Amino acid sequence: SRVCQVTGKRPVTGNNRSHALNATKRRFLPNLHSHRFWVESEKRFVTLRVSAKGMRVIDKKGIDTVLAELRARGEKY
Amino acid sequence: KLTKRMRVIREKVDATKQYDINEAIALLKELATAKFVESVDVAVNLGIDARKSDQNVRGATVLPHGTGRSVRVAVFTQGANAEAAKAAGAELVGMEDLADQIKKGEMNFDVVIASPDAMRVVGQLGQVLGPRGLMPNPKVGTVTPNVAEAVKNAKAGQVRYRNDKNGIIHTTIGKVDFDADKLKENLEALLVALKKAKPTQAKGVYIKKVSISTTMGAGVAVD
């Protein structure tokens, strides 16, 4: 499903407004993108489904550090 | 193309950048390079444009330092105001005779002042005095019952100004030989009068730029 593998962002629901404030249910989905991240330690490319906000934290945190937290959650690669 | 005289003028002033009043007045004193004594020529640009009718400004200002610009005063008035004008030093005082002298071409005066009763006679001179801008107008204080004061107030250094179509102010604070400090006071007194004259609707910086120049001198910006 539409879940970020780094930040865990998932679709959320809200209202479409209008000039008359009429509220209709809607969904907000993350800006998810499938990217192949280069992991130096394994000298390999690993593909992750990440949001655009997740991409920013990867540079700040390091490719190895983020993957270590994901392994704590536990998943396939 | 440019001669040596003109190239040294632009070498002394680098107008591409702004200058402060203290520096600007120093530059003006060094720009006085002519055979005859020069007069400061004001070059102040107003953000407001006279293209709107109601935004026109007409004003007057008496300067204690003075300008030196000829101030021969012709006065149209009768009775006690004629004696008061003569006692105040008016060179020419009369009514119909002086108007007829003007019609005959005797124009040995620099400033006309009229009493409101004399406006009937001065009105006939509108074809002559109008194009030259010498026509008395109440908005500049040259139409007043206190004729003696108008003759006084003038004489020394009373200066006039009228906005053009391009919304620019070209006055004269005084002669170039005037001291820098006095010249700074002269322009400062002028400047406050302009602020009072400013209207309200004008949604623009009242002054678009302030510059000073002499006869052959370059324009130095004032801040």
Partner: protein
């Protein structure tokens, strides 16, 4: 995206020059091709350490250069023996082989290529002034006394 250069990528500079650059450049091109590495605190210090360590290597080599230099510069004149030229030209020449055996014994060890014999191949017998170039900037000096055998 601060990243420390590993080479002379385009106009970015040369090896070892941290520069601010758009994320994408390094996030997918510089790093996966190995042309650079993120200049993150840890990495930059290590590279700066690499800078100063090679400087110390440069220091050490030039330091040991002056060592050899002085060792042999100050006097340290050598004596060699060959078949007397009978008051004039000492018959045969002395070349790369024997000028290097002289220094070997007497101390400092120099390569035949290093040896710089300026005045031809030193054929005449007498005082001769021979220099050595142990290092590119080191200008060593030696006096050689030729004697008959």
């Amino acid at each position: 995206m601060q990243v420390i250069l590993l080479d002379k990528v385009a106009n970015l500079g040369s090896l070892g020059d941290q520069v601010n650059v758009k994320a994408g450049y390094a996030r997918n091109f510089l790093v996966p091709q190995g042309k650079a590495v993120p200049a993150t605190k840890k990495n930059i210090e290590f590279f700066e350490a690499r800078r100063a360590e090679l400087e110390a290597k440069l220091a050490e080599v030039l330091a040991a250069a002056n060592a050899r230099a002085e060792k042999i510069n100050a006097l340290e004149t050598v004596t060699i023996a060959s078949k007397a030229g009978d008051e004039g030209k000492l018959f045969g020449s002395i070349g790369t082989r024997d000028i290097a055996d002289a220094v070997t014994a007497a101390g400092v060890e120099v390569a035949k290529s290093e040896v710089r014999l300026p005045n031809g191949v030193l054929r005449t017998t007498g005082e001769h002034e021979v220099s050595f170039q142990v290092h590119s900037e080191v200008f060593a000096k030696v006096i050689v006394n030729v004697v008959a055998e």
